[model samples]
Target: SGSANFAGVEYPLLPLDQHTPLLFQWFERNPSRFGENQIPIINTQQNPYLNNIINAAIIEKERTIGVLVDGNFSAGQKKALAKLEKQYENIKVIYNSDLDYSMYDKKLSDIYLENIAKIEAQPANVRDEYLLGEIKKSLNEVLKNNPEESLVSSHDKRLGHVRFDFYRNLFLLKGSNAFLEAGKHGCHHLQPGGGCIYLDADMLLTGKLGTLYLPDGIAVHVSRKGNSMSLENGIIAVNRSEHPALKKGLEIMHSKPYGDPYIDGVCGGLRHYFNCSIRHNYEEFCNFIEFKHEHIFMDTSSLT
Candidate 1:
C-alpha cells in the first residue's frame, strides 16, 4: 500500500538509520527485512540496517528501488547505493544522534532547567499532581463508560518528563508550548501536514506497519493501553514538510544541540504547552489511531 514489495506484500519505507539502528531494524524485523527479503531486488549481503532502508527510501523516493548503502555496508551496502545514485537526488539519513552537539554543551540543558523554573514560578502553572488529578478524572470517565478498557502512567520524574521529549518536539514544531501544556492537560491530537515515524532500534515490527496511512498528516497515539494523557515517543512517524508544526520542530531541534533529543526535544516543549493549556482533539485522535499499524503495533513503552 505504501511502496516496497516482498512477495506480493507492498509497504512503504519508514525512514531509518543504518548504524546501530540499522543493524537492528531487521534483527528486530522478522536479520532484516531486506536480508530475508522475498523481494529479489533487495537482500542483506552483510548486516543490514533499518536506518539505511529509510534513508534510501527518502533519497530514492520513486527514482529507484534503493539498496541499503550507508557507510556500514560491508559489501553491497555502500557500493550499490553509490552505484545507483542519481545526480539530482536528495537525502537525509541522519538521526538526532548524528547532529554536532559539541557547541550546545550546556546551553540546551540550561534552557530546559530555565523553562522548568519558569513554569514552576507561575502559580497559574498547574503542577503534575493537579494535572494528574485531571487525567485521572478523564480516565475514570473513560473506564466508567467502557469497563472493558483502561490505561496508566507512573509519577516518576525522569520517567514522565522524558515522555515529553517527543511532545516537546511535536509541540514546538506546531508552535505550541510542551512543558506547560504537557500531555497531562489532555487534547493531544494536532492537525498538520504529515507525520514522521522514528522508532527505537530495539523495537520489533509486530504487525502491518506500512499498511498504516495518515491523511491528516502528523498523528499522535495513546502511549499505553489506558494512559489518556501520554503517547508513544518510542516510534515517531511524522512528516516535517507537510506538517507546519513539525517543519519548525526540525529547526527547533537543530537550534540547540542538546546531548539528546530527550533534553530540548522533551523538556521545554511540554512545559510550554502545559502553561498555555493548548491541546489537540478527541474524535480526530481516535481517527488517527484507527489506521492499522499506526499504534500499539510497535512494542514501545509509554514511560516518558
Candidate 2:
C-alpha cells in the first residue's frame, strides 16, 4: 500500500498523501501552534470555499478536521464517502440532506420570478450594467434545468435548488442551520466561533494549514482584477461565525427580493463589509492560483 491510505478523503484534487502527511507531521511536532480541537470544516461536495479554511490557517494552529459535506454527491461518490467516514476517527462527515430543507422558502420560485421580472423591467441600459446584468442572468439561469450547463446548476432540476444550498452552507458554517423569511429562521448543531474552512475539491495544499494567521474578520484572496475587486470561489476564510461583516455580506446578498447572491462575480459590497486584503499569496497554500491563470498550475510534477 502507498504510505498513506486515502479511502475516505473523497475525490481530492490535491495529493492527499503529500498534503495530509504534511499537516499531521506539523501537528505532531508543533502542538502549541494548533491546539487539540479539530478544525470544524464545511464544504460542499461541489466546491471547497470555507468561511474560514483560509482564515483558519492564518489565525491558529490545529489539524483541520471534520466536514459537513453538502450532499451533492452521486451514488458512487456516496460509496466513497462511506469508506471515508470509516477510515478516519477524527474526520466526521455529514450530508446536506441531514439538515431540514423544509425551512427554506417554499415560495423561493415565486421570489426568483418576481426578482427576474424586476430586473427585466429595467431599461436595457440598466439591465446591461455589470452587476444588474449578472444578477439578471444568474436569476434567469437558475430558473432553468440545463444539464449541459453545469452540474451544480443542473442536477437540482432547477438551478434554484443549488442556489438554496448555497445559503444552507453559509448557515451551516455559522454553526446554525437556517433559512431567512425576509424569509429566514435558524438551527444550530455546531457552536459559534469554532470557525470553518472551505477549499475547493480541485485545490492542492502546499503550505502548512496550521501556520497561516487569520487577522480578525473575513478575508477573500483576490484571484482576478475587475472594475472592482472580484472574488473567486476557490479559497475563502471566515474566522468567526458572529462577525458583523458576515451579517452585512448576507444582507447584501439577501437585499434583493429574490434573495440570491452571485458567488463567483461582483463582490465590492462584500469587500465594503469585510477587511479586503487582495493578496494572491494566499495561493501559496493551494495549487490553484486564481489571479494569475485561467486553469490549474502545479510547480510539482504530480499531484496523485
Candidate 3:
C-alpha cells in the first residue's frame, strides 16, 4: 500500500466553496490507506473580485486549508484563512506569495516573448482553424492504439501561429493557472517516490480512494460518461513527484499552449512521455466519487 495524498482548488466565498468542508468530512468518515500526515491540499483564490456592486448598491461579504493560495492574499483573505485553519486539523494554508516563483516567472517570460512576436505578425483566423484541424487529425492517429505503439509524430509548429488574443489568453491566464494548479501536487518539494491525486474542488468522495500507486508517473482515468477521447480532467493521479514524464508534460503544457487543441496536445505529450494510455477505472471511480455540476457563472439577480 502506498501513500494517498489528495489536493483540490476552490474560489473564495463562492457557493462551490461549501464543498470544501463537506469533502473534509467525507475524508474523516472514510479514512483508509491514505497517508495520515498527508493533508488534503486545497488551492483557492486569495482576493477574488466580487464585482457585486449592483445598481450602485455595495453588497459586502467575506471568505485555503492545504490551500495553495492562488495569486496573492490580502488582510481579509488572510483572516479568513486563519479561521479556516482553526476549524480543521488537517487544513493548512500555503501562500503562493511565500513561495519563490522566480523560475516559473523566468520560464513564462521566455515563452511569452518568443511567441508574442510570431502571433502578432500573422494574426489569421484561417490559419488558427487550420492548426486546430491539424491537431484533431493528429489526435485521431495518436489515440488509435495503445500509447506505446502510436506511430504519429509529435510536435506542431502551427500551434504557435494562433491569433494574438488567443495566444495571450492561453499563455498568460491558462498557462499560469496550470502552474498554480501543479503546486497542489507539492511536486516541487515532495520526495520523488511519493504520490498525489489532484481533484476539482467540487468533486466529492463517496468512498475511500484505496491506494495511490502508479507504475507510470501519471494516470489518466476515463470520464464516467464513456467519453473515450476525453480523460477526466477533474481528477489526476501522479505516481511520483520526480517522474520524468510528469516534468516534461508540465514543460510542454507551458511551452506549447496548443490553443483549441490544448488538452489533446498535453495528453499526447504525457502519454508519449509516460508510455501509457487511459485507465478503465471509470466504473470504480464513479462509484467512489460524485461530481456536482454547480452553476458557477449564474447571476443571482437573474432569479429576481
Model 2 lDDT vs. the true structure? Answer: 0.37
User: Candidate 1 at 266: error in angstroms?
Assistant: 6.6
Ranking by lDDT: 2, 3, 1
- Write the residue-wise lDDT of candidate 1 on 224-280 in tens digits: 465453434444444332244343333445443222354334323322322212354
| lDDT of candidate 3 over 12-73, digit per residue (tens) | 21112221211011111222222333322232233111121110111101111233333233
Which residue runs of candidate 1 sit more than 4 Å off their true CA positions?
Answer: 1-195, 225-229, 247-296, 300-304
lDDT of 1 at 93: 22
Model 2 segments more than 4 A misplaced = 1-64, 67-80, 101-106, 109-191, 224-229, 257-260, 263-269, 275-304
Q: Model 3 misses residue 190 by how many Å?
A: 7.3
As for candidate 3, its clashing pairs are: 42-66, 66-92
- What is each predicted model's overall lDDT from 0 to 1? 0.33, 0.37, 0.33
Model 2 residue 46 CA deviation (Å) reads 16
For residues 1-304, what per-residue lDDT tens digits would candidate 2 score against the true structure?
1221122222212211111111110001122222223232333434333322343233322343334444334455556545554554333344544544333223334444556677678998777466565655665665664313322223234444344435433543353222111111121223334444444434444444432234342333454334344354444444444445445545444445433343411243344443233643323322221223222232211233
| Decoy 3 TM-score against native | 0.42
